[PDB]
C-alpha cells in the first residue's frame, strides 16, 4: 500500500524559550538499559564538592537498582548544533536545541577494595596467586 511509498512534509517550529531545557542522555550499547523496570530514578549532582560544572549521579529504584554517573560532553561544537525533532499530529515539527549532552556509565555496587585494603593487598602483586582467594577472603 501507500505506506511503502508515502511522502510527507511538515513545518518546523522552534519555540523561543521553554520552561525545561533539553539535554541528551546516552548509554553504552552493552548496558542494555530498560526504562520499564525503572520504577524510580534520581538524577542529581555528585557529592565530591562536599557545582554547576560537576558530574551527575543517576540512580534507579533507589539503592536497590542500577547506579550511573553522568559526565558532560567536554567537546563543544562551535560550528554545529543538535536538535530533537518530535512527531506531532498537527503536521508540524517542534525542535528543541540540545543544551547539554551527558554520557552515562554504570557504577558497580559491591564491596570494592578500599584505598587502605588496596594498599595492603598491593604488596601481593609481587607473588599473588589464585586471585579469587583475595575476594573470598574479603
Amino acid at each position: 500500500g501507500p505506506s511503502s511509498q508515502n511522502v510527507t512534509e511538515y513545518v518546523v517550529r522552534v519555540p523561543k524559550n521553554t520552561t525545561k531545557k533539553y539535554n541528551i542522555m546516552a548509554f553504552n550499547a552493552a548496558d542494555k538499559v530498560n526504562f520499564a523496570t525503572w520504577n524510580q530514578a534520581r538524577l542529581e549532582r555528585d557529592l565530591s564538592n562536599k557545582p554547576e560544572d560537576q558530574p551527575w549521579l543517576l540512580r534507579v529504584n533507589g539503592k536497590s537498582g542500577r547506579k550511573f554517573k553522568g559526565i558532560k560532553k567536554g567537546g563543544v561544537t562551535e560550528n554545529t548544533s543538535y536538535y530533537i525533532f518530535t512527531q506531532c499530529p498537527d503536521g508540524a515539527f517542534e525542535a528543541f536545541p540540545v543544551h547539554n549532552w551527558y554520557n552515562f556509565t554504570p557504577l558497580a555496587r559491591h564491596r570494592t577494595l578500599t584505598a587502605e585494603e588496596a594498599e595492603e593487598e598491593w604488596e601481593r602483586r609481587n607473588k599473588v596467586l589464585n586471585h579469587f582467594s583475595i575476594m573470598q577472603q574479603r
Binding site: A30, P106, A108, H110, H131, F132
Partner: protein, 114 residues
C-alpha cells in the same frame, strides 16, 4: 578463545571449576557472578601461527596509488582484469614473498593469493 564479561559488573570472567559437579564455570572476580561455560577450552595459543594475511588485508588498498596493478589476474567474483598485488607486510611472515591480490573494482573486496 572467546572472552566473556560479567553481565553484572562488565568485568572479566575467569574460568572456574565446581568441585561439587566438576564442570567449567566462568566466574566473575570481585562480583560472585558465575556462568555455565560451554566452550570447555580455557586457553589456546598457536606457536606457528600460520594465519592467512587475507584476513588482515583490507579491501580499501585497491585505492592506494603506490601499489602495483596487473591485468593478468582477473578477479574470480567479478572478472575485473585489473588487480592490485603486494606482499605480506607482516613481520611474522618468515617468508614474506608471496603475492596477495585485491580486486580493483569498486565494492568488490575479493582477495586471493597465487
Amino acid at each position: 578463545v572467546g572472552i566473556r564479561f560479567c553481565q553484572e559488573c562488565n568485568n572479566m570472567l575467569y574460568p572456574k571449576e565446581d568441585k561439587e559437579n566438576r564442570i567449567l564455570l566462568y566466574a566473575c572476580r570481585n562480583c560472585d557472578y558465575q556462568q555455565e561455560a560451554d566452550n570447555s577450552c580455557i586457553y589456546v595459543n598457536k606457536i606457528t601461527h600460520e594465519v592467512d594475511e587475507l584476513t588482515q588485508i583490507i579491501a580499501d588498498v585497491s585505492q592506494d596509488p603506490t601499489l602495483p596493478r596487473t591485468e593478468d589476474h582477473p578477479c574470480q567474483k567479478c572478472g575485473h582484469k585489473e588487480a592490485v598485488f603486494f606482499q605480506s607486510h607482516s613481520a611474522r611472515a618468515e617468508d614474506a614473498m608471496r603475492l596477495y591480490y585485491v580486486c580493483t573494482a569498486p565494492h568488490c573486496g575479493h582477495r586471493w593469493t597465487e
